[PDB]
Amino acid sequence: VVKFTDSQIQHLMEYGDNDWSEAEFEDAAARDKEFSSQFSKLKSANDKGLKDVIANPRNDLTDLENKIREKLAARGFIEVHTPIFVSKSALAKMTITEDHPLFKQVFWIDDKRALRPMHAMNLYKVMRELRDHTKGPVKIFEIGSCFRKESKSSTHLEEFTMLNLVEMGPDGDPMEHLKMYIGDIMDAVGVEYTTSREESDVYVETLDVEINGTEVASGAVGPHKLDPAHDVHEPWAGIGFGLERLLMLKNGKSNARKTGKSITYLNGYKLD
Amino acid sequence: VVKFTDSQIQHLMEYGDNDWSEAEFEDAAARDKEFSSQFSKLKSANDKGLKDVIANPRNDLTDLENKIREKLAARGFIEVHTPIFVSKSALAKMTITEDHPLFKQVFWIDDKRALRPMHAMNLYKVMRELRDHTKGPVKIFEIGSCFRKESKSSTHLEEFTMLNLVEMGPDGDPMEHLKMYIGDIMDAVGVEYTTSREESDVYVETLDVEINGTEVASGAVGPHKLDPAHDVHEPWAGIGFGLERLLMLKNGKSNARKTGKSITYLNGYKLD
Numbered sequence A, B: 001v002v003k004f005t006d007s008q009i010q011h012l013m014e015y016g017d018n019d020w021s022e023a024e025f026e027d028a029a030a031r032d033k034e035f036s037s038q039f040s041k042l043k044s045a046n047d048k049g050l051k052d053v054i055a056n057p058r059n060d061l062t063d064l065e066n067k068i069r070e071k072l073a074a075r076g077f078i079e080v081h082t083p084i085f086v087s088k089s090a091l092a093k094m095t096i097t098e099d100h101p102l103f104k105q106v107f108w109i110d111d112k113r114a115l116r117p118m119h120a121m122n123l124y125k126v127m128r129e130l131r132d133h134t135k136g137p138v139k140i141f142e143i144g145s146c147f148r149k150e151s152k153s154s155t156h157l158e159e160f161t162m163l164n165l166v167e168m169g170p171d172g173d174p175m176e177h178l179k180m181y182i183g184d185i186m187d188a189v190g191v192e193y194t195t196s197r198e199e200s201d202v203y204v205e206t207l208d209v210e211i212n213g214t215e216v217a218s219g220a221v222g223p224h225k226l227d228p229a230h231d232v233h234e235p236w237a238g239i240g241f242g243l244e245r246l247l248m249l250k251n252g253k254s255n256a257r258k259t260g261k262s263i264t265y266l267n268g269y270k271l272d
Helices: A008-015 A028-055 A060-074 A088-093 A101-105 A120-131 A174-189 A243-250 B006-013 B028-055 B060-074 B088-093 B120-133 B174-189 B243-251
Strands: A085-087 A113-115 A139-147 A159-167 A194-198 A205-211 A214-221 A237-242 B085-087 B113-115 B138-147 B159-168 B194-198 B205-211 B214-222 B236-242
Touching (some): A008 A028, A028 B120, A088 A113, A120 A159, A159 A174, A237 A243, B060 B174, B085 B088, B174 B194, B205 B236
Antiparallel strands (some): A085 A113, A139 A159, A194 A205, A214 A237, B159 B236
16 A cells, blocks of 8 residues: 655666556555665666667667668658757747747747757758759758757657658659658658548648557648748648657657757666 | 959859959959859859759768768767757866856856857766776767857858767777777768877877868877866877868868858758
């Protein structure tokens, strides 16, 4: 009728990924006996995991990116690296001004610049100017950090790695093209997935993708209301994936902070 | 007698990397003509390269990073991805206070966090805590962007991709280990280089790296002076390279803004 306290679960959740939610005990002394035994059990397995990294070096995040890069490369996508700084006017083009709920989540650098909370601003600009240099499909994507202000015990990261791809002039059907790129992304992760195409009024069609019943991304297809503000006048398709959450699901990790850019974790193992 | 306008020089440096500094003409009529013809020629050459990226997608920055990654991995290095936010305490351990000349160019987020202007802060903590998990050599490196406030003359970038490697607990001669790693990076970019080794102290030895008599990097081997502030008490080696300036020298670009993270350049070609 008693189990772990609120701060000894926190140590077990830092060195291990298993759910100690309902592991009951006889008394307050029996709960302390297994905590110390399990706390050292995870601590030493966490130690041997990093010893394996030192013997067989690798970076889980880089390895995943390079597989996504080479799958999208077979489809004819150009990888671009856009700046992290974005303008106040670019954010205003995406309806993101003071009345928008995402406005208070924005890290401002000066009165005119901020850290990008998404890739749409820079990809809208790049994909349109590429249209000036070709009459065929524009296929670009980017992998890099975006930033948002968050609650401090919230599960969401303040800096997270986003993968956003977009095709601006599909030679085939734009929705079928996006579904095929989804499958390319999922095979790089190694998981199977569920897709559910659903209607919407502000896009032409929406594609909700989910892994094990958990929605992880939603793609758009067709002309959007914000297109004329970016001088875009053709049907397009695109979707964004959070890469830390994908690693967390593939590796059964406790939370997204264990797989992202961090000074306390490395390939999922704790450093201190 | 007469030579190019300053406005004409800027136009030709935005579409080409050729030096039109010392070309002279008869008078204004002949100067205004070669400009219009060179400008039109550079544009279609710039256009022809963008069409080649569309026909054969690539990204010179990713292509170089991965080549560096796989050469360092053969040496037993571990790629780590650390956060971009850093505390003002972590900077203070690096003597980056109001006293320091780097303080003025620091991008602050709030009063206790800033955007990293170098990789030393985060690499200090990851290399030290990995000592708690092995007795042999500690080898890590990061490829990521750091931020510094620059003036509007702006021939240094505000966001630049830094490559910083660290070898701790040498396992051999640390200086020749560093000499070798430099050759690995230089073979990845594909340039002939020279070295210059001077004696900082009885403890540390510095090594300067120049490409075409232009210094591109500075490294130190031994017990660094800021080690006690990070609980580090053993010799190590490290050096950082600007990935943009390296790409600028190999491809002969006119300035590093054509090779970095940009919305106007894509593999060195202008988009607008």
